[PDB]
Subunit: 464 residues, 2 copies
């Protein structure tokens, strides 16, 4: 009897982007009703690949809330096996502000249009809930934005110059990563990165697909210069952000106060904790890497700020953990644990998206595989850094959120945009699935609308 | 754990079109997983208002099944209060054959492109599961199609010549309804009715729309000639179909054996059971009406074929019942009962989608209202023809299906394409809602995949 079922979850609203569905929706977990949804194409967005999102604190989400959801475009339509005859896909890379008003969603604005930065990968809210970052893995640009004035606080380009320009070897044998503070180049303080402009490669490196670039499977004009920026995740204590770069397996720490990169964490087990960042011009820094052992993808801080996690993938499948307890000095942050399992020894599964419990005692980590292996959730003890349980969910598992009273993990799986998809709920006490709800969605994201800034510590702010 | 909850629904697959979401999806009600979905826009359908659908018998739906789903287009995008700036929307009126193969959907063909008939209103499967009809109330055309060969069996235009050419009086004061058997006009045996071609009005009439048409609130080139065809529903005993025409409030019975109209049933309480059809040329019939007392919309046979129902709307809100137990002679079909309620005295609710229990003992009927009145489900005794109970569900209630063991009615509500939406499940023993599943959809339809031709008797075949 279902009232009893939902009544246990509490008054929390799940938001999900639909990827190839083109939708965003909000669902009330306390009743199982969908409160509202919006279809990008209704508005003239002809390629609404609704990708990542974050929501800002609201005193009463059921009366109103805001979020940012972005899109990808161009040939991103062509990489998930849908046999479409579309010849010229919409450019995409939109960044939309959407407000729920208690009845419906309202499309407030297109921040990519206003600012000129079209960025299609992770969206993250800043810890005070008053700005957000968006990163892009085809352009290798990220920016932090002020929500009130819809403007750019900072924007950076990250470039790779490979030691070996052979595409198979362009990362393995190392390189120089250059970080450049960008300045607007169009009148009105606008950037020139609308739609597909700035792309080094012609579609994103897909879930699990970091190496397709080196293997010669991705077209583009600047293939060996890619780093595949993914996310800028936030230290919940403030001041610092971590920019994940998937191909070199590096999280670059930035000082948000002066907007400079300070240190570069190196993912791979058996490599150093970090490499220095050297300033080479007023607006340009470099990191030198002799080699890249493995790519890395998902990244995040623990709620208290004292641990940072980076998921090595493909060449190694592990969770790398740094002690980040020294808030004053990121060059003191040192690897302190690595979560490994014999069953992660192949190419897959990849340790993937994460969410921590509010008390910081456990981290849930998705386990991604290509079809047809069931994808699932790893439950990790975040005090001793040991894997506790793996639970199978279904195909193409993506993000996890958690109810902010810490009782229930809520995840989405997304069927590779063509098979089974769902919203899964896991009880954090028993670490068992309490159920599956249907979901028309290929979501690579999901969030529970936060009420407070403290909620963001366990939302799309600290972690992907 | 919802496990227990879904186990009781049994192994049934629910299909739903998205309306303004642009998707179709199948949900396994035994597990809560969405088996597969498809997004019209991915395929270059720029205005995929996914509208009506029917599914065919499959001996194991979990291993595979097929269905037809159609779309609307043109200005139908502009009538649900979505503040879109789109100036020239996609033409639409597609008719897609979709096959689930056990893992995903395959968009098999575009039967509208293949045949040239673009029809955007109800889709209904024939009782043998080998064909399907599609009607359209902007064009006033319907056709029955052979599924195997994806070809037209028959197609008809219905036209209104009003007694009074004043648009406000064009139906009230009666007229002559002309039925024409159509012939292809293009090479290849194609029709010339793709996209918006053949439209007499520029959108489908909304609930209560007949007054908005009379009042001059709907644009179009042939406003006084519209009958607003809705559906061709099937006698489960075979041989006959009923074509509903909303504005005259008539269901025209056709002999599927020779493809000729045989009698016209008249909806309104206090009018004759029916009027004669006269053949006036090889391919043309007429029905004469001295007056039209009220419009009517939803229409359907009981599972045994012995009752036909037609929902008077707007000027009367009732369920008109005919004794249709004479299978040999529709001209003998006579009004036997009318379901009325003091609460039906206003403009709304409109009685408008239905589903019968397998044993024929009850019929569930949706109660539609404009926002913000809660919409709901009426439960009618289909032996004594009395209203038993009304239950409130949500905003914008649409269709009802029933699991084929007769245990659960499954309905969808759709938030006027902007607010709350969901799938509701009602236990047919207590006639109480057992609960609500989230649903990103503005669905005007839903069906449960049939196993047998007997299942179609309670599916999108005998009723809308
Ligand atoms: Cu990512
Ligand atoms: Cu993901
Ligand atoms: Cu993604
Ligand atoms: Cu209808
Ligand atoms: Cu409906
Ligand atoms: Cu509709």
């Amino acid at each position: 009897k279902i009232e009893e079922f939902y009544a246990q979850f509490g008054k929390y609203i799940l938001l999900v982007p639909g990827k190839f569905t083109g939708t965003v929706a909000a669902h009330d977990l306390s009743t199982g009703r969908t409160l509202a949804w919006l279809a990008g194409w209704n508005y003239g967005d002809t390629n609404p690949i609704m990708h990542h999102m974050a929501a800002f604190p609201s005193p009463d989400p059921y009366k109103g809330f805001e979020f940012i959801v972005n899109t990808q475009g161009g040939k991103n339509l062509f990489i998930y096996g849908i046999p479409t005859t579309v010849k010229e896909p919409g450019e995409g890379f939109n960044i939309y502000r959407v407000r729920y008003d208690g009845t419906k969603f309202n499309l407030v604005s297109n921040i990519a249009e206003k600012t000129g930065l079209g960025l299609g990968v992770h969206v993250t809210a800043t810890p005070d809930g008053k700005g957000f970052a968006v990163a892009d893995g085809q352009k290798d640009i990220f920016a932090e934005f002020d929500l009130a004035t819809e403007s750019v606080r900072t924007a950076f380009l990250v470039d790779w110059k490979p030691n070996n320009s052979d595409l198979k070897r362009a990362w393995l044998e190392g390189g120089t990563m250059t970080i450049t503070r960008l300045k607007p180049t169009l009148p009105g303080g606008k950037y020139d990165y609308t739609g597909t402009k700035g792309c080094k490669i012609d579609w994103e490196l897909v879930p699990g697909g970091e190496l397709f670039l080196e293997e010669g499977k991705v077209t583009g004009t600047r293939q060996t210069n890619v780093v595949a920026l993914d996310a800028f995740v936030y230290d919940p204590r403030g001041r610092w952000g971590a920019l994940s770069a998937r191909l070199p397996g590096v999280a670059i720490i930035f000082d948000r106060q002066d907007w400079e990169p300070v240190v570069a964490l190196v993912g791979a087990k058996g490599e150093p904790s970090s490499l220095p960042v050297k300033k080479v011009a007023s607006d340009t820094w470099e990191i030198k890497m002799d080699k890249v052992v493995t790519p890395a993808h998902q990244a995040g801080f623990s709620p208290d700020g004292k641990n940072f996690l980076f998921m090595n993938g493909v060449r190694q499948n592990n969770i790398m953990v740094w002690d980040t307890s020294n808030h004053a000095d990121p060059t003191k942050w040192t690897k302190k644990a690595v979560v490994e399992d014999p069953g992660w020894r192949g190419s897959y599964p990849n340790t993937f998206h994460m969410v921590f419990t509010p008390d910081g005692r456990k981290v849930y980590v998705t386990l991604w595989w290509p079809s047809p292996t069931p994808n699932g959730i790893a439950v990790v003890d975040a005090r001793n850094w040991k894997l506790l349980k793996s639970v199978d969910i279904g195909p193409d598992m993506h993000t996890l959120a958690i109810t902010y009273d810490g009782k229930y993990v809520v995840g989405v799986f997304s069927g590779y945009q063509k098979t089974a998809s769902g919203i899964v709920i896991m009880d954090t006490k028993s670490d068992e699935v309490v159920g599956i709800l249907p979901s028309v969605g290929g979501h690579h994201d999901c969030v529970i609308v936060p009420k407070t800034v403290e909620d963001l510590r366990c939302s799309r702010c600290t972690t992907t």
